[PDB]
PDB file of C-alpha atoms in Angstrom:
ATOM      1  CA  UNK A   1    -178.048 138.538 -24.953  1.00  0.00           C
ATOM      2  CA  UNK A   2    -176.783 139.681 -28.004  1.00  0.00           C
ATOM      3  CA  UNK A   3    -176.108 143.144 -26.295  1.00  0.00           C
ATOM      4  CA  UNK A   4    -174.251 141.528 -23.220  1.00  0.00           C
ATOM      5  CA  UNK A   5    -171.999 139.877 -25.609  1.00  0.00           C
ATOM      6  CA  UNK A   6    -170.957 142.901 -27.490  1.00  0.00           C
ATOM      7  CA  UNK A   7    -170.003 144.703 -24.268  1.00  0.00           C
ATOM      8  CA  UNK A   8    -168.017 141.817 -22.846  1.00  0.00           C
ATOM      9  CA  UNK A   9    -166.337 142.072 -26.647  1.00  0.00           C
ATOM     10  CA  UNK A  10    -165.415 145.586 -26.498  1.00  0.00           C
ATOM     11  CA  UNK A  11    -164.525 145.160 -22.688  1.00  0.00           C
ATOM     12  CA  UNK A  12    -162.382 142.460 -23.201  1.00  0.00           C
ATOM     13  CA  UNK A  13    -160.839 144.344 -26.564  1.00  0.00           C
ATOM     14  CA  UNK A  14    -160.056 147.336 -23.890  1.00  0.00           C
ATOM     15  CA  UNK A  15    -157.989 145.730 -21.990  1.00  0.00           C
ATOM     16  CA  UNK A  16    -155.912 144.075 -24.288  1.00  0.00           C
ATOM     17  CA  UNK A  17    -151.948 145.504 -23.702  1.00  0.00           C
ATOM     18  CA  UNK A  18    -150.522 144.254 -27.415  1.00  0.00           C
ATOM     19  CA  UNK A  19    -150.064 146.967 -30.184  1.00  0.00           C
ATOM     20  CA  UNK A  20    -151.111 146.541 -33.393  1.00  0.00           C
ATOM     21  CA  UNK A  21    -150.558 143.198 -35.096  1.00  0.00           C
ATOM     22  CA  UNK A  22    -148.805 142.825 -38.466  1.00  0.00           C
ATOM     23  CA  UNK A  23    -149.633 139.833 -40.700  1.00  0.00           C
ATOM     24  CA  UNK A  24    -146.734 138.589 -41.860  1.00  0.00           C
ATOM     25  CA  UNK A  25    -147.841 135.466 -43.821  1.00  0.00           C
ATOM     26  CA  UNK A  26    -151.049 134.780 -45.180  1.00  0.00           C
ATOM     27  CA  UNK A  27    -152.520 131.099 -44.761  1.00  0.00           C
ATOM     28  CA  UNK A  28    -151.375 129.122 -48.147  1.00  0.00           C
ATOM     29  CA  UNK A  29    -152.612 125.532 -48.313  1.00  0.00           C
ATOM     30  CA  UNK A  30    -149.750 122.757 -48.609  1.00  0.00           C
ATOM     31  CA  UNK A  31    -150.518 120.688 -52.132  1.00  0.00           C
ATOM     32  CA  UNK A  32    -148.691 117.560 -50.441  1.00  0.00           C
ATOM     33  CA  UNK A  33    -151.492 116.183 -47.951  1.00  0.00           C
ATOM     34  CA  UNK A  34    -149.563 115.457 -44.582  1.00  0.00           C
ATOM     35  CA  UNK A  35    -152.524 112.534 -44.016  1.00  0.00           C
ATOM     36  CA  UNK A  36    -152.446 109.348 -44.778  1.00  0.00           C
ATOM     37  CA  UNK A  37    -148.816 108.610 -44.812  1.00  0.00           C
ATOM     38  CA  UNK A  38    -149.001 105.587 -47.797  1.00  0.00           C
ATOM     39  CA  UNK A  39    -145.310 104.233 -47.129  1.00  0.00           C
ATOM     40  CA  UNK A  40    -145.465 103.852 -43.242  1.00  0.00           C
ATOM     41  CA  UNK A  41    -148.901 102.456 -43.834  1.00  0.00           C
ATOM     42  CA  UNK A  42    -147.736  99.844 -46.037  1.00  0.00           C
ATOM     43  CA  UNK A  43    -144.657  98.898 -44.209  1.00  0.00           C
ATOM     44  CA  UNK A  44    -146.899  98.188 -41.097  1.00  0.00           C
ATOM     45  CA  UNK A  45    -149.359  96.120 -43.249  1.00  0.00           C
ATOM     46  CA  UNK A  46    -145.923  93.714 -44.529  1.00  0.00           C
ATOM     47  CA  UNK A  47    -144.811  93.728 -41.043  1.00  0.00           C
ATOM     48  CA  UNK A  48    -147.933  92.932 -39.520  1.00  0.00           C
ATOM     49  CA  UNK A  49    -149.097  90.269 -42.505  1.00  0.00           C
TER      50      UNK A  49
ATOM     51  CA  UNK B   1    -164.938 171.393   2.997  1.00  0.00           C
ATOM     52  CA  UNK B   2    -161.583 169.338   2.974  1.00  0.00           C
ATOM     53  CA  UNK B   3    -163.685 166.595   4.137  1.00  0.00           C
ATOM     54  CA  UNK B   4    -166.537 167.142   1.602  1.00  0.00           C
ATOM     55  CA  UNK B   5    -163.278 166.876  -1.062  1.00  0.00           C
ATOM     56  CA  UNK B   6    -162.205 163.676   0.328  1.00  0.00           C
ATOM     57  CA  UNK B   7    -165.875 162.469   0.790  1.00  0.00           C
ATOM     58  CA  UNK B   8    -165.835 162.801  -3.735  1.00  0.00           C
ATOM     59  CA  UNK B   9    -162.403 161.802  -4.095  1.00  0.00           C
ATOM     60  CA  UNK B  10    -164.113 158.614  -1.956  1.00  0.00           C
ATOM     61  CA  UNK B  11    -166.881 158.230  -4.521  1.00  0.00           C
ATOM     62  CA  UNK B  12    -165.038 158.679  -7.477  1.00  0.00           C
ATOM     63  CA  UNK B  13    -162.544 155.930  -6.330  1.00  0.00           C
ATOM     64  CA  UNK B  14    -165.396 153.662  -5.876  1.00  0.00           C
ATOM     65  CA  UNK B  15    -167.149 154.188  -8.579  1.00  0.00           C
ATOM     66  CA  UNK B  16    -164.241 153.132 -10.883  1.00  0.00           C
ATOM     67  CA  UNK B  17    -163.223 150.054  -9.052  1.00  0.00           C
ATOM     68  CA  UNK B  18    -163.225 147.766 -11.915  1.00  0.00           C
ATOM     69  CA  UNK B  19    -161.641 144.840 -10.967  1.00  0.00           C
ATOM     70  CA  UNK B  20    -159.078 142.395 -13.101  1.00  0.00           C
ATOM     71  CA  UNK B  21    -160.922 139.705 -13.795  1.00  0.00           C
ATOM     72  CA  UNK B  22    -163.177 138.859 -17.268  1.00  0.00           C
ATOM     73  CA  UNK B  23    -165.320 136.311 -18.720  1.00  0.00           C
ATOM     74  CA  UNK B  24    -164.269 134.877 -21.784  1.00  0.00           C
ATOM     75  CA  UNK B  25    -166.121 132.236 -22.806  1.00  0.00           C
ATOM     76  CA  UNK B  26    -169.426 131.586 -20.693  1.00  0.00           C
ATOM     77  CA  UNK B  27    -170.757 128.435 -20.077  1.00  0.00           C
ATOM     78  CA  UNK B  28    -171.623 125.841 -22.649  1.00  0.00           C
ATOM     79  CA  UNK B  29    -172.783 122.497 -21.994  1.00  0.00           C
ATOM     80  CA  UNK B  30    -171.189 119.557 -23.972  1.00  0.00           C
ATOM     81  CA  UNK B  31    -173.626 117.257 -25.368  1.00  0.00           C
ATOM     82  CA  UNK B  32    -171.487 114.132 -25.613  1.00  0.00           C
ATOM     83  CA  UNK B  33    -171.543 112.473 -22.029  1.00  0.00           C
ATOM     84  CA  UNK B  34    -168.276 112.363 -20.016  1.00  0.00           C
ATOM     85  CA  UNK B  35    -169.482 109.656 -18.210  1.00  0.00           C
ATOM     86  CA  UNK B  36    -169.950 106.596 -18.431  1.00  0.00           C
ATOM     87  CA  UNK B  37    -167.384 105.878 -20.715  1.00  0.00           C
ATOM     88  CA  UNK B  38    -169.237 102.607 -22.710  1.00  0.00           C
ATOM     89  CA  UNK B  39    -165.980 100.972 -24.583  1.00  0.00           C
ATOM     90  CA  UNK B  40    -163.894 101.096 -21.767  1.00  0.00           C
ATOM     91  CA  UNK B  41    -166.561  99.725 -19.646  1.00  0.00           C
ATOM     92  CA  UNK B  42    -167.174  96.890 -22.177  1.00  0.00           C
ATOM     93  CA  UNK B  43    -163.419  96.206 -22.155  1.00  0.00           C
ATOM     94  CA  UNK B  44    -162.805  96.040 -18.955  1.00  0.00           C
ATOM     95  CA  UNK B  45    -165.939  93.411 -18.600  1.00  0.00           C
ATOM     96  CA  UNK B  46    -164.725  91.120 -21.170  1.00  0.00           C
ATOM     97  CA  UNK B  47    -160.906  91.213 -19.756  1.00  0.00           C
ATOM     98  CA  UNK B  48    -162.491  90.640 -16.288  1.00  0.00           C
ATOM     99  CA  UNK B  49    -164.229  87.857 -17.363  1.00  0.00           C
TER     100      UNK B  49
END
């Protein structure tokens, strides 16, 4: 099995039509967390109350 | 001998027929059921009722 998967890899590389790829931007983590949003969750909490 | 020529040509051509078409990702099963779907069916029982 293992086998079988490396050829389909290497087939599947071989027929790939892009060039070579240039990383522009390397992953940085964002310090602000995007989740939970505190304000919009305590608006609907007064508006629900 | 022309037709000898045309008889490889032939099996060359065959040979290297590779066609357009590649597997990915083979099959995985998904262990959490599609169906039934419980909470919907638990729902709908109590709005019926």
């Amino acid at each position: 099995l293992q086998l079988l998967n490396r050829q389909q890899e290497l087939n599947i590389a071989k027929s790939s039509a892009i060039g070579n790829v240039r990383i522009i931007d390397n992953a940085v983590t964002d310090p602000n967390p995007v989740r939970p949003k505190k304000t919009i969750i305590i608006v609907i909490g007064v508006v629900l109350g």
